[PDB]
Structure formats: C-alpha cells, structure tokens
C-alpha cells in the first residue's frame, strides 16, 4: 500500500520543493525520518520543522527555503565497505564534494563524510545533493 514512510516523506519533500512551496506537511513520522531530516537541516538543505502529535503517528511540518536540489532513499539497504563508500559517492552524486551520502552504522545514522572522520561505515539509506 503506502510504499514506505521513508520513501513517501522524502518524496513529498522533493515534490513540494520543486513545485515551489515554502513549507510542507508529512504524515507519518519516524525515528528514522526525524534523524534524516536533522542531518539535512544540519547541512543546510532545509530550514526548520515542527513535529506534531496526535498519538496515531507524528505529523511533521518542514519549512524549506530553496537550497534542496534532490534528496532520496535507496531501496536495497545493502552493505558497503570504505573504498566502496568512496566509489559509491563518486558514482551517485553529481560530483565529488557536491552533496552527501547518508548511512546507518552501528555507531548511528550520519553522513558519509563525518562517518569517515569517525572511521566507520555500514549500510546506505539515501543521498542528498
């Protein structure tokens, strides 16, 4: 039915910020959605956002300026080494220092650059550029 919380929430952001709306509504929320969006706002791609509750599922209202270009989710959350981190970045993003790669490690959910600073790796959620 509903394909995935991650897919649909991220795709809602993408649609609205290409159509031209200042702030979007998303339902539901998730630990993972929240963590992802925190990474995005940390790097600048969006602005700031509310989490609304009704006990059924958290809604989220995200004010985004215009800085996003695209950002999304990988379906097979496969496994990647460190040399493969580098090759995967260069092979996905529009260029080398352009964007970030977003991962789940046993250490936590986090971008590929500060992942490498911690000298950790793991599986791959998505990508921002």
């Amino acid at each position: 039915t509903r394909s995935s919380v991650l897919a649909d929430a991220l795709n809602a952001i993408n649609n609205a910020e290409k159509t031209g709306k200042r702030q979007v509504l998303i339902r539901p929320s998730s630990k993972v959605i929240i963590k992802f969006l925190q990474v995005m706002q940390k790097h600048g791609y969006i602005g700031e956002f509310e989490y609304i509750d009704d006990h059924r599922s958290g809604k989220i209202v995200v004010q985004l300026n215009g800085r996003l270009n695209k950002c999304g989710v990988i379906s097979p959350r496969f496994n990647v080494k460190i040399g493969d981190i580098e090759k995967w970045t260069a092979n996905l993003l529009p260029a080398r220092q352009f964007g970030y790669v977003i991962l789940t490690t046993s250490a936590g959910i986090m971008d590929h650059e500060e992942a490498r600073r911690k000298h950790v790796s793991g599986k791959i959620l998505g990508f921002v550029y």
Partner: protein, 147 residues
C-alpha cells in the same frame, strides 16, 4: 538574533544583556533610523515584537496569520515600518497602533523575502521568493513596477 536576542557589545566578549518575549527563536532584527534606542524583530511564532533599549525590555508583540521575513523602518518618519510577510504581502505598520496596518501592498504571487525603503522615505522595494522585484510608492498600495 538566535535562540534569544542577545544585545552584544564590541568590547565585551560575553552577551551584554539578553532579551526575549517567549522562548521561541527570533529570525530577524532591525534597529531604526531615528530613535536609535528602539529595536524591532520578528520570530518564528509569526510575531513582530518591538523592544526598547534605553528601557531595555520588549515592549509589544503582535501575532499575525503568517510569519514575517524581514522588516525595515522609514528613515524619514521614525515610527512606521514595513514587514515583508510570507502571505505574499508587504504590510505597512505604524508603531503605536499595532491593531491596524497602515497599508498592505498586495501583488506578488509567492512569499516576500526582503523589503526596504528608499532613503527618501517614499518608496519601497520588495524582493520575493517568486523571481521578481516590486517597487511601491507608499501612498497607493499596488505594485508600481516589476523587475
């Protein structure tokens, strides 16, 4: 302007004095052109809050139907400003009576992300998230020219 409006000083390495109405952020400051002791700021609870400094405290708060992105005072008149406001508008306020807007300039189609006054205290430029630029002559209140 951050979590709470800190009034800094150049010499003192620490926030000289903190100010805030309610513990929301504050997204825009601007002082005024005369009465150099009066401050105005807008914050993410859709509010315009005026502050004094020679009295050193917030003085008034208005909550609108949608946030204001940036405000500016008119260097001829010292107590009217315009507030460029995401509901696709430029709202012209007088200070004392914040129960009514002196004007409302109304001809963009997306949010208005900055605004300013021709230092001849007559003319307004409004730049919008929609890729244009208005000028308004402050006595009418529609768009006077679009770049």
């Amino acid at each position: 302007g951050g979590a709470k409006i800190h009034l800094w000083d150049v010499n003192r390495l620490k926030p000289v004095s903190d100010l805030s109405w309610g513990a929301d952020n504050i997204t825009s400051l601007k002082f005024n052109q005369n009465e150099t002791d009066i401050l105005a700021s807008t914050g993410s609870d859709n509010s315009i809050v005026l502050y004094d400094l020679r009295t050193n405290s917030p003085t008034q708060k208005i909550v609108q139907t949608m946030r204001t992105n940036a405000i500016c005072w008119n260097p001829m008149e010292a107590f009217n400003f315009v507030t460029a406001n995401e509901d696709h508008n430029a709202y012209y306020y007088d200070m004392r009576n914040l129960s009514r807007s002196l004007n409302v300039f109304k001809d963009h189609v997306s949010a208005v992300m900055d605004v300013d006054f021709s230092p001849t205290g007559d003319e307004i430029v409004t730049g919008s998230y929609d890729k244009s630029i208005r000028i308004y002559k402050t006595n009418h209140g529609h768009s006077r020219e679009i770049y």
